[PDB]
């Protein structure tokens, strides 16, 4: 089914996981290569790969208000991130947006 705005998206690319954050209307915000923060269609980001909503830490952490998640995510679009791209970094990025820093 369709993700809700603010949902973390776990993308099962062959031999590595990619993370994105759903921001609504078919769009995810995520770290990609030219690292740049991008707003793209989930359809394009997923591609032919399997993916799932994984609001992993909702059991133990409060997600931020969803309006804050989307606002913040979309604020960063266009910005380079000084750290490189691994699943852990992409995951920490989408986690920072959903839950805050901590």
Q: Helix coverage percent of residues? A: 25-40%
Largest sheet data = 5 strands, antiparallel
Q: Which architecture name does CATH use?
A: Alpha-Beta Complex
- Give the structural class: alpha+beta
Estimate nothing, just give the exact number of structural domains.
1
Q: Give the strand line-up of the largest sheet.
A: 4-3-2-1-5
Number of helices: 3
Number of separate strands: 5
Report the CATH superfamily: endopeptidase domain like (from Nostoc punctiforme)
What is the string of SSEs from the N terminus onward?
EEEEHEHH
Radius of gyration: 12 Å
Distance between the termini: 30 Å
CATH class: Alpha Beta
- What is the molecular shape? globular
How much of the sequence lies in strands comes to: 25-35%
Which fold does the CATH topology refer to?
A: endopeptidase fold (from Nostoc punctiforme)
PDB class: hydrolase
Keywords: alpha/beta fold, phospholipase/acyltransferase, phosphatidylcholine, phosphatidylethanolamine, membrane, hydrolase
Assembly: monomeric
Entry title: Crystal structure of human HRASLS3.
3D structure, described in words:
This protein starts with 7 loop residues before the first strand and ends with a helix. The protein has a single domain (1-102), classed as endopeptidase fold (from Nostoc punctiforme) (Alpha-Beta Complex). The protein has 3 helices and 5 strands; from the N terminus they run E-E-E-E-H-E-H-H. The protein has a 5-stranded antiparallel β-sheet. Strand 3 and strand 4 (36-41) form a beta hairpin. The radius of gyration is 12 Å and the shape is globular. By secondary structure, it is α+β, with helices and mostly antiparallel strands. It has helices spanning 42-46, 66-76, 87-99, and strands at residues 8-13, 16-24, 27-32, 36-41, 50-53. It comes from Homo sapiens. It is a single-pass membrane protein. Residues 8-102 form the LRAT domain.
């Amino acid at each position: 089914p369709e993700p809700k705005p603010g949902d973390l998206i776990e993308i099962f690319r062959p031999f590595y996981r990619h993370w994105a954050i759903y921001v609504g209307d078919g769009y995810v915000v995520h770290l990609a290569p030219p690292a740049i923060v991008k707003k793209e269609l989930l359809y394009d980001v997923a591609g032919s790969d399997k993916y799932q909503v994984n609001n992993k830490h909702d059991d133990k952490y409060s997600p931020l208000p969803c309006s804050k998640i989307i606002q913040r995510a979309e604020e960063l679009v266009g910005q380079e991130v000084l750290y490189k791209l691994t699943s852990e970094n992409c995951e920490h990025f989408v986690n920072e947006l959903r839950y805050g820093v901590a």
